[PDB]
Design a protein around this nucleic acid. Structure first.
Ligand SMILES: [Cl-]
Ligand SMILES: [Cl-]
Length: 152
RNA sequence: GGUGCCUAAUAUUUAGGCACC
């Protein structure tokens, strides 16, 4: 198992559960726009959360789509970041749980969920490679080692 | 077979399409 392999095996695993990582720049700006919509306790359907993040993301990142942002929203939902108000005959509304209404706390949950998908897929990826994959630098290895230890 | 993307749904997930290998 070389790195170019583990990275393509990691991203395919992620997309297999209907989730997505748009690269370290765009994913960071995607999460922030999710926080911009939700940090005040506003309650948005998937559809309105997607339109909000897509429309603001588009001018800097033209590849942003309802599908690609749906997949990022699915990653947060799969990480159990949302309070979901279920009503009859209507779309469920999503709020950010009180504990995940800041970027640091939301991002930790996001990183953790990608690591659980690596483990579900039997992928064994060291922290230097994690730092690279999620942040595009080597400045997050400890962060990553912290999430790996919690999950084991 | 496999990947990638697009469209749709109240999705801890589905369903459909195209492209490429
Ligand atoms: Cl409400
Ligand atoms: Cl809450």
């Amino acid at each position: 198992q070389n790195p170019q392999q583990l990275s393509s095996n990691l991203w395919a695993a992620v997309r297999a559960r209907g989730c997505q990582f748009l690269g370290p720049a765009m994913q960071e700006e995607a999460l922030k726009l999710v926080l911009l919509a939700l940090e005040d306790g506003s309650a948005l359907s998937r559809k309105v959360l997607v339109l909000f993040v897509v429309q603001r993301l588009e001018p800097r990142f033209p590849q942003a789509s309802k599908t690609s942002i749906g997949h990022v929203v699915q990653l947060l939902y799969r990480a159990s970041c949302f309070k979901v108000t279920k009503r009859d005959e209507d779309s469920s509304l999503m709020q950010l749980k009180e504990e995940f209404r800041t970027y640091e706390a939301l991002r930790r949950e996001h990183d953790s969920q990608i690591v659980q998908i690596a483990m579900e897929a039997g992928l064994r990826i060291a922290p230097d490679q994690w730092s690279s994959l999620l942040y595009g630098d080597q400045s997050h290895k400890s962060h990553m080692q912290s999430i790996i230890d919690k999950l084991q």
